[PDB]
Paper text:
BlCel5B crystals in the substrate-free form and complexed with cellopentaose (C5) were obtained and diffracted to 1.7 Å and 1.75 Å resolutions, respectively. The substrate-free and complexed structures exhibited no substantial conformational differences (with the exception of the substrate). Because of minor variations in the loops located distal to the substrate-binding site, a root mean squared deviation (rmsd) of 0.33 Å between the complexed and substrate-free structures was observed. A single protein chain occupies the asymmetric unit, and most of the residues were built, with the exception of the first 17 residues and those in the loop between L398 and P405 due to weak electron density. Similarly to other members of the GH5 family, the CD of BlCel5B has a typical TIM barrel fold with eight inner β-strands and eight outer α helices that are interconnected by loops and three short α helices. Very short linkers, D429-D430-P431 and V331-P332-N333-A334, connect the CBM46 to the Ig-like module and the Ig-like module to the CD, respectively. Both Ig-like module and CBM46 have a β-sandwich fold composed of two β-sheets of four and three antiparallel β-strands interconnected by loops and a short α helix between strands β3 and β4. In contrast, the CBM46 has three tryptophan residues, two of which face the CD substrate binding site, indicating that it may be actively engaged in the carbohydrate binding. The CD binding site of BlCel5B is open and relatively flat and is thus barely able to properly hold the substrate in position for catalysis without assistance from the CBM46. We found that the SAXS envelope can be well represented by considering the superimposition of three different representative molecular conformations of BlCel5B: a closed or CBM46/CD-occluded conformation extracted from the simulations with a relative weight of 26%, a semi-open conformation represented by the crystal structure corresponding to 40%, and an extended conformation based on simulations that is responsible for 34% of the SAXS envelope.
Here, we report the crystal structure of a full-length GH5_4 enzyme from Bacillus licheniformis (BlCel5B) that exhibits two AMs (Ig-like module and CBM46) appended to the CD. The BlCel5B structure comprises three distinct domains: an N-terminal CD (residues 18 to 330), an Ig-like module (residues 335 to 428) and a family 46 CBM (residues 432 to 533). Full-length BlCel5B is active on both cellulosic and hemicellulosic substrates and auxiliary modules are crucial for its activity. We find that the large-scale conformational adjustments of the distal CBM46 mediated by the Ig-like hinge domain are crucial in active-site assembly for optimal substrate binding and hydrolysis.
Author numbering: 20 to 399, 404 to 532
Amino acid sequence: TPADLLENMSPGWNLGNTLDAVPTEGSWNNPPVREHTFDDIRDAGFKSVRIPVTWDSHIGSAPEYPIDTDWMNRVEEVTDWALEREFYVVLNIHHDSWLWISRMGNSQQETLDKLGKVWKQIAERFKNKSERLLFEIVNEPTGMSAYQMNLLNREMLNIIRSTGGKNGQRLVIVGGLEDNKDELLHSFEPPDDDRIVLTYHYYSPWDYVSNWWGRTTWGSAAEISEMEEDIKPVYEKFVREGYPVIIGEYGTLGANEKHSKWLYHDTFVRLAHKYQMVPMWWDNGNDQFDRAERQWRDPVVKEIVIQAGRGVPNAIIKPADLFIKKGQSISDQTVDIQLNGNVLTGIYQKSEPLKEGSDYTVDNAGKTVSIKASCLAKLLQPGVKAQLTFTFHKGASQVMDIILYDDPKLEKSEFTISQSAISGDLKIPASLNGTKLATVKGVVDSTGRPVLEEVWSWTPYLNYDEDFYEKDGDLYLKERVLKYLKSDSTFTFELWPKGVEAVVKVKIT
């Protein structure tokens, strides 16, 4: 049942940008995966792992398309490591989707024949593995009609089932075009098979999860309702008619603001759990778990996923970052808690409890905390001076950073660039003094229009990572942005806390 799949697999995590890298494992930002990484993911409490695999460069010539023996052995080695740790494991065909499977539209007979020969080999090799191994037919398929998609699912499923044995009953994961929710609802037709699982990916709102166009925060009543409105119809059409469902990918993709990130993950994973959908977290190796340091970049959001993935609601504090300016008058500070049914059990500085009464008070409802000013003053150069851990009877703890900040200071605020010597990003050395980068906008000085008008006409706000970023306290404008510059322009780096900014002028010769 869908309930069974949820109990057994929720929550999951993706081994992203690894076996799916191009041309081979280790070609991108992760080295080839080490066995102990699976021990670390198990320590975290994930019940399942998705192992995206890109087969492309390891597939031999027509007509038999033999998969390189060393590659097949490697994929089995990693898959076995995961299975030995009692994970439910999803094995797929990944970036092949746009590398060659998208030739389906223009050359179906040849492409479908090739994919069939590939799936037959994968199915044969993994035929005798535990039922904890699931096959996913193809990641985010594109370049074909909805009819072709349905045909592809049917034909590949038939190939897997025809190998017999344990593959006769193995769960197989199928979706619509682009693993898209709307396609699943409207153009997808379930194969006639009672051992399939449906899938879609979820990354909405795209501009929030990616921090595009200044969308730095998430969590309005409208946004929460829209998220449930995206998910509920898949439950109504499919889950309550008995189809298990896996959300093969979800998560933030560069969004950094802490409260919103925590709220987004708690809300989504709780909705997934509510509607009996298995949520599998996307992590490209730089997003969440640091495999080299063997620690999570944001431990709190991980604990939120682990608890919400088990149907345990998490309490959410606001603010998550408490900004106090150097020199400012220190008053009692209010912390609101969205309890989500939980009860606050204490507030700690590491292992040392704060004293209720003198350090802080709580209202009768237990959801509004006042941190007394003398306590704050004791807790406090700019930077993180303290971390307060809010513990709850159930669910993840919330950690609030106490940050002393001051006005950000730029060594240089005006830069000259020529249109013919542009090569690499523009570095803007800064002393951010405890502040954090939120977003950036760029305006052409003479016209008042967006610097990137040629691509995004409606806004001057830029996109995280592809246009701007912060690194080691310095600010950067990407080469992409510089190439669109025609005359003198002004960039406004908006920081946390809100209202703090740094203005940089760029002169064009």
